[PDB]
Amino acid sequence: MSGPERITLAMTGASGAQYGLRLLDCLVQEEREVHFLISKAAQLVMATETDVALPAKPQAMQAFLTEYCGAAAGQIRVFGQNDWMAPPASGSSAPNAMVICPCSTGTLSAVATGACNNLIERAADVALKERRPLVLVPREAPFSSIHLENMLKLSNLGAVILPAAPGFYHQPQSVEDLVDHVVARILNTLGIPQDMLPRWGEQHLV
Amino acid sequence: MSGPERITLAMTGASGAQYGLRLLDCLVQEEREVHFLISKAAQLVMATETDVALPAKPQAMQAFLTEYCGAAAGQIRVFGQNDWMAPPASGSSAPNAMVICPCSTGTLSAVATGACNNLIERAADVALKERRPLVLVPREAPFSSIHLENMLKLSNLGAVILPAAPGFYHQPQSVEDLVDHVVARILNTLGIPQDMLPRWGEQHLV
Amino acid sequence: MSGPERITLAMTGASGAQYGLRLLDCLVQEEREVHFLISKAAQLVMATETDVALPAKPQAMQAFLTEYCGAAAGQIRVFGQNDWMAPPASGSSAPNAMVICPCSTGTLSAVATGACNNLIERAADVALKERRPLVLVPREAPFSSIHLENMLKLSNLGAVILPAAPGFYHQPQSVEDLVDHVVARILNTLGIPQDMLPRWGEQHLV
Amino acid sequence: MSGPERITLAMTGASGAQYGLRLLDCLVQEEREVHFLISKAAQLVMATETDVALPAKPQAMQAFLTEYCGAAAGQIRVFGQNDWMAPPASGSSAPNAMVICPCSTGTLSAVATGACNNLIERAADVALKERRPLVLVPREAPFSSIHLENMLKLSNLGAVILPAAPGFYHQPQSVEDLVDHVVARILNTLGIPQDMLPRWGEQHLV
Amino acid sequence: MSGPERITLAMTGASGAQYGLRLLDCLVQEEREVHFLISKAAQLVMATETDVALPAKPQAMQAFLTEYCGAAAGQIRVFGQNDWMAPPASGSSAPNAMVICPCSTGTLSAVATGACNNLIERAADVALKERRPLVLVPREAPFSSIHLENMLKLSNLGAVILPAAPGFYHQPQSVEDLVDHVVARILNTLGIPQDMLPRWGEQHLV
Amino acid sequence: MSGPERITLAMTGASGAQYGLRLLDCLVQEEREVHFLISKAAQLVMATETDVALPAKPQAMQAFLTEYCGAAAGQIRVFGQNDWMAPPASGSSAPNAMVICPCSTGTLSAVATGACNNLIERAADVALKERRPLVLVPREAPFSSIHLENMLKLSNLGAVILPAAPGFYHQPQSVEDLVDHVVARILNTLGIPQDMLPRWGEQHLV
Amino acid sequence: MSGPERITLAMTGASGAQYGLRLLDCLVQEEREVHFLISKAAQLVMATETDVALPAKPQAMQAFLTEYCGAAAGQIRVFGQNDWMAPPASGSSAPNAMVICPCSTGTLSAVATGACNNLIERAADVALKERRPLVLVPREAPFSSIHLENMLKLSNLGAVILPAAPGFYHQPQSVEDLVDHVVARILNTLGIPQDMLPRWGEQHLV
Amino acid sequence: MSGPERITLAMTGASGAQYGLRLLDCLVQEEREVHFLISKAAQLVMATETDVALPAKPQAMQAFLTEYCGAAAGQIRVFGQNDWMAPPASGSSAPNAMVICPCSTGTLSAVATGACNNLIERAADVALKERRPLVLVPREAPFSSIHLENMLKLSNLGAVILPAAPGFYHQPQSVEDLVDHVVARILNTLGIPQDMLPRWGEQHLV
Ligand SMILES: Cc1cc2c3c(c1C)C(C)(C)CC=[N+]3c1c([nH]c(=O)[nH]c1=O)N2C[C@H](O)[C@H](O)[C@H](O)COP(=O)(O)O
Ligand SMILES: Cc1cc2c3c(c1C)C(C)(C)CC=[N+]3c1c([nH]c(=O)[nH]c1=O)N2C[C@H](O)[C@H](O)[C@H](O)COP(=O)(O)O
Ligand SMILES: Cc1cc2c3c(c1C)C(C)(C)CC=[N+]3c1c([nH]c(=O)[nH]c1=O)N2C[C@H](O)[C@H](O)[C@H](O)COP(=O)(O)O
Ligand SMILES: Cc1cc2c3c(c1C)C(C)(C)CC=[N+]3c1c([nH]c(=O)[nH]c1=O)N2C[C@H](O)[C@H](O)[C@H](O)COP(=O)(O)O
Ligand SMILES: Cc1cc2c3c(c1C)C(C)(C)CC=[N+]3c1c([nH]c(=O)[nH]c1=O)N2C[C@H](O)[C@H](O)[C@H](O)COP(=O)(O)O
Ligand SMILES: Cc1cc2c3c(c1C)C(C)(C)CC=[N+]3c1c([nH]c(=O)[nH]c1=O)N2C[C@H](O)[C@H](O)[C@H](O)COP(=O)(O)O
Ligand SMILES: Cc1cc2c3c(c1C)C(C)(C)CC=[N+]3c1c([nH]c(=O)[nH]c1=O)N2C[C@H](O)[C@H](O)[C@H](O)COP(=O)(O)O
Ligand SMILES: Cc1cc2c3c(c1C)C(C)(C)CC=[N+]3c1c([nH]c(=O)[nH]c1=O)N2C[C@H](O)[C@H](O)[C@H](O)COP(=O)(O)O
Ligand code: NA
Ligand code: NA
Ligand code: NA
Ligand code: NA
Ligand code: NA
Ligand code: NA
Ligand code: NA
Ligand code: NA
């Protein structure tokens, strides 16, 4: 197996709920264990932007997502926003890679300053102190200087700032094609196999 | 008329040629005069990503774009990359707003450092020294710290860093819907009317 | 009409509730549409420092403030602290100027770091990314270096840091006279007519 | 006796002459020795904003202020703006605490840069090099980034930046009540007894 | 009317008195109200470099300049260097744009540090805190790092640093032609009509 | 296999063409796939400093280098300076490590600022945004502060700054021995086996 | 002989071609050897702003300039923009002082960042690393913060930033008089005799 | 005589003992007085890398080096590492230029921080405070960010950072040829004649 066996996937309240759901689906299909976290504002984004009827409490959310993705039992773990006994909350936990997708500007801010106000923010704080992979997927426009300084600080610290900015260079034909471009970039960054985005120039000899 | 009468629209070599073309179309439909600039690498992006057969030389490019957009005579001006006699090259020119869409990381770098190697880069240098509007639309992922520092410097100077990061919160049904979200943000930033992106919460009283 | 048609007026938990109320009154009398936001701590300041019996829920607060100011129907909109569907929460909203008066040091901090924890903080984050006017009215003493660095960062970004520091140079005779000095400065900054603070030296020829 | 026996009280040309006069009165009533300094612009502020007829030359100013405050003989010393033989001008002097109230933005600038152009500015330069207390009471609005950077530099060096921003949380009934709030904060900062501002929550057990 | 109705025009002691006089003439011919300020060192520059016999006291200076420019009564106001009751000294004044032309390196320094030692320096301090236009026209060579850091700080704050560096690209035939180039740039920056500098490339279609 | 299977080897115009050629030879002998890039100025360095008759066009250059190194078919790929369809130009490409050897101060500058003016510079920009290995081998003396700041920025970002500064501590007997020291350091940095530089102190027990 | 025997004189594409030509003339008349470099954009400036018919290729340009200045044979050397075998390209060359006059903002940028894209930029990079004199003569207005930061960086490194800002204090009577002021400043900076600008106050005893 | 009459030559513990010895030889042949200093670690480098049997104590080391170089009596002075009475230890000494060749990263660090732990480090501290020439010849690879920041600080202060990075552009045929390139660069930097490195392009006319 290439790439991390366990991924902490946090969804926070920026537009782009489809990116998180599609990423979750691909992680499940690659037989990865996913520790799934979702903020209160992200739950509202999902209700506004999609037809997914995501249950509110973690136990029922875990059942729903398992059915939605066709995951194995225990493959998707769901942890609530104040569950400090969950693996992502401590560096003594087993190593995960972490993705925040979408990453709201508020969560971006909290991770940059170390606010640790909820399990998503603490889990990123832990990823940085343990030097485990951390990928942030912001979705905002314009990016203000406040946004950019927070992204730059975290990038300087080794976090990967991967904006939800799909490329158009494989003739996209649908919204789903654009979503897949970003999801493929994330999987590439994590080192996890994907077949949605070809290897640029791989056939190009001279 | 709300917003600028004249817009310098530069296209540079990031993916997202559709954003530039659609923005050009909307500017024409709003009866704006457009000074159109396109880099050599952007011409290659357009040939790779779209079915637009854009002529190479400025005179023929100007004819093509006028037909493509249904523009009036002289409404679209095309200037070549070393035409230092064109309006965008001097601050003594008449005031324009400027948009670089897409904005490659190379053009982002040149504007941040003041390289002024071609008319697109000099025109942005002029926009900054004259404190005229400058909007950059980067399309890249991940954003490295090199990218982010250049974006932050320019944002601190008053340029608008508007990444090609479409929002999903008006139920997009096609690639064109996502393109329009970004194009609408640009038009909003310039203060030019648009009807593709509703005013959020405008009906919301309490 | 001079100045902004719509103003987001946020009250947060620093002493000086009278400044916010008087500013709200003047905005109403200038026929401006006001999107009114108030933090939980500010509600407690108002109960401690004034005899205003402000209702707690937005619907009833909106009724009360309309009566208090003699506003027209719909002229004052009240939005709760987690109402992400309200206009101030998105840059795709119609343009407002924004004033935080009083601005607590906690809200000052959140805006400086981009925390976006509630609608007041997100609305300021949106004002900065859209380059729409943002005026902060802190009331604190001493200002620590933590306070000052946050004020300096935001001032460098174009926010107006307007401390609740009334001037004495028009022979004030009451608390209300000192309140009006600050409120007049805010209206001047927004470009909205006021007749409480004369134009200094306007009659002075030589 | 709690707090400093000797206080250098400098008045400079910001609005708020009443704060300086009331502070001088309270220092006298607490039996402190006051080295009183006043700038040329502050003399003009006092003539504009109050009915105090302050004599111009130090000898007569010293007589007037002694009568005004009911001070003992020699309790108030007045020194002119170029009197480099006065105690405040040398660090070899006996230790004083220093307050500049009001502190103009020009005096703020001079102290931040070390300009030492007059006795007020040199005395503050001496307070900083000897690490003796220095309290600045600016009165300005907006604070520009120039103001804020100067305040931040001095706060980082241990000066207390105490803006003339009265609090409203003890039901003020007059201009004098608001003046007293700021004067009480200054006395608190110096460690000198005052009974104008109660100790917040002192009776609050749980 | 395009551009500001009122302009504060300060002349300080760099070489280039002709620029200030010609700018004053053009502002008068565009029917603008001018608040004219001149430093002691600038008066000496004018006596050294020109044949203008400028009276020393403001009242007589105001009479002379009115005759010199052919201005209407009250169109040119002259204020002395310590006239703190003049409009430029307070932000509560009516809005002006401000130009310092020529701008000595000493006045550049004072504005960068906030020294506010005279009415010219305070008026610029007020322009910055009120975010009203401020244009500085330095004339010096070489620019030292001290000069450049002061110019950069002020440019970062939104002041326009416009050096007296005339362009040669409209075939200048006299000293007056070079003066007019700089004066035209200033008028362009203020948004005030001028016909001395053509709009570059305005006729250039492709 | 230890170390990267694919290496992008860029040669740019600093003295030390022998280092690049010898590194290319060792990579081939370790059965690595090499994507070979060479700048116009580097071609001139090679003609000036060596007797290698390197063909100019990529197709013929690829034939020559394959013969020169005894490489397998397709093992060395050559890409021209504007071939944006080559793998190194996009982060969606398959992962490579990248070495610029020699690295001119001009290419050092471009990578530090993100200029992306040609395929070598873009490929390094891509290596940094994808956090793939990037090794720069500058050859210059003195290093100016411009050089050093660019090297420091890139080192802080995780690029390896490996100057062409051979060590003398294995009794070098020829120019080739000194070349091999640097080439061995590069291979060590990449994690690729080499037998030219012994493991220091490997036999040293106490 | 006072001052440098050899001067590298680079002309780049800012307005002010007359300054470069007049400086070249004075260097020739002082019997200095001049290594003359001119950018493509500067050639266009010279054709636009003057009646000098400068040949394009270096050999013919060298003949023309020798006749134009009345120079001795070999006294003016002309080198093309990619002639890396010319003395200015290597620090191992014989010591020259270097002047870029006019210095475009693009060349200013390249020297500040170390871009070294052509012989002019590399020659300045070499002057800085060898700590040989480097004088830049920018001609631009306004100077943006991008311009100013580049000038400040280079000034901090010991380059002389000498803007084309002529002084008026020797009663100039023509364009040529203003040109000579700047040219005289450059010669003063290089330590080369000139008689166009008197020594200020040289006769002034007390 | 061109260049300094007296040179402090310090050898510290980086590889490249041959550079120091060859530089010492050339300084002697140019009839310069050399104050020779060598660290304990450098003595070990010399024993490891060369066949020079350098005596340990200064008196015998001075005899050996005089014979080795064929120096005149008293032409080479040797001072021990704690000889604070030696000329290099005080700025009141007669002016020397100073070279540290090789310069270990430890000595680089000490000079950058001012550690002054031995005579070599103090002598460099003295060279910097007296603004006398200081040339550092580091030999290390990779350069870490710790190395680079120390080199940048010292370069900004006017020290010459000259890495042991020989050039290959005069067809080197032996180790000695590469050593001579670096030694020639050092002599060039000091302004001392050398005939090992030709003047680049000196014969190149056009
Ligand atoms: C509920 C909500 C919140 C949006 C929002 C919307 C919704 C429905 C949309 C989808 C209609 C439009 C855009 N949204 C974005 C957004 N923040 C952001 O950084 N990017 C966004 O694209 N916000 C605000 C963000 O959710 C708030 O600032 C939260 O405080 C974030 O909290 P969290 O980090 O804990 O999720
Ligand atoms: C030709 C080409 C260049 C791409 C590229 C592609 C093509 C076809 C695609 C479309 C297949 C994939 C992505 N592209 C991007 C890109 N640079 C960038 O910042 N974002 C991009 O999305 N690059 C590189 C960029 O064009 C180069 O760095 C140019 O030097 C930019 O030059 P310019 O600023 O003058 O346009
Ligand atoms: C309830 C409360 C909070 C005061 C306070 C008081 C009250 C009654 C007063 C009125 C008696 C005295 C002073 N107050 C101030 C204050 N914060 C501040 O920056 N300036 C103040 O003047 N605070 C604290 C501030 O409200 C808290 O730090 C909140 O967390 C701010 O939260 P908010 O930004 O969401 O309003
Ligand atoms: C005379 C004068 C000067 C005012 C002023 C007024 C007057 C009458 C008022 C009272 C009508 C309105 C406001 N004033 C302020 C002010 N500077 C400042 O920082 N805050 C102020 O509130 N200024 C300007 C300030 O006095 C000048 O910049 C002086 O140079 C300060 O010099 P100083 O530090 O030596 O006192
Ligand atoms: C009187 C005087 C002062 C010159 C000067 C001359 C004169 C006659 C000239 C005209 C002969 C030559 C050049 N001048 C300049 C100059 N300062 C400057 O920045 N640029 C200049 O070009 N100075 C110095 C400047 O005037 C002093 O530093 C003043 O202190 C500035 O004070 P101010 O800002 O209040 O005007
Ligand atoms: C042609 C050429 C260019 C040399 C040069 C020489 C040649 C023959 C030598 C070999 C004779 C001597 C030294 N060279 C160096 C050099 N730049 C550098 O950083 N280190 C060097 O050692 N330069 C300059 C460098 O090539 C230019 O600045 C190019 O613009 C670099 O462009 P590139 O990065 O695209 O290759
Ligand atoms: C051809 C051209 C280019 C001008 C220009 C004009 C012309 C005719 C004028 C003379 C009509 C007006 C002003 N010019 C200036 C200018 N750049 C600058 O920094 N200052 C200037 O004054 N520019 C732009 C500058 O030449 C470009 O940015 C080039 O890329 C510079 O390239 P270079 O550094 O290699 O010369
Ligand atoms: C004895 C010794 C020390 C080497 C070393 C070796 C030896 C034999 C070699 C020659 C086998 C290989 C490389 N050497 C280097 C080195 N430090 C350095 O900056 N560059 C080097 O090339 N070091 C370490 C350096 O000498 C130590 O860090 C000392 O503390 C430096 O002390 P000094 O500055 O007082 O001389
Ligand atoms: Na917390
Ligand atoms: Na250029
Ligand atoms: Na939050
Ligand atoms: Na002084
Ligand atoms: Na002052
Ligand atoms: Na480019
Ligand atoms: Na280059
Ligand atoms: Na020590």
Residue numbers in the entry:
A (entry chain A), B (entry chain A), C (entry chain A), D (entry chain A), E (entry chain A), F (entry chain A), ...: 1 to 206
Task: Quote the passages of the study that discuss this structure, keeping the authors' original sentences.
Originally thought to be redundant but distinct decarboxylases, it has been shown that UbiD is in fact the only decarboxylase, whereas UbiX produces a cofactor strictly required for UbiD activity. The UbiX enzyme catalyses both the N5–C1′ and C6–C3′ bond formation to generate the fourth ring of the prFMN product.
In an attempt to further probe the DMAP/DMAPP specificity, and explore the putative role of the (pyro)phosphate in Friedel–Crafts C6-alkylation, we constructed F181Q (to mimic AnUbiX) and F181H (to mimic O157UbiX) PaUbiX variants. Upon reduction of the PaUbiX variant crystals, it was apparent that F181H was able to catalyse prFMN formation. The in crystallo behaviour of both variants is mirrored in solution: F181H is able to form the purple species indicative of the prFMN. semiquinone, while redox cycling of F181Q with DMAP leads to a spectral species with features reminiscent of the DMAP reactions with the DMAPP-specific AnUbiX/EcUbiX. In each variant, the DMAP specificity was retained, and crystal structures of the corresponding complexes with oxidised FMN and DMAP revealed little difference with the WT PaUbiX structure besides the mutations itself. This clearly demonstrates the nature of the residue at position 181 is not the sole determinant of DMAP/DMAPP specificity.
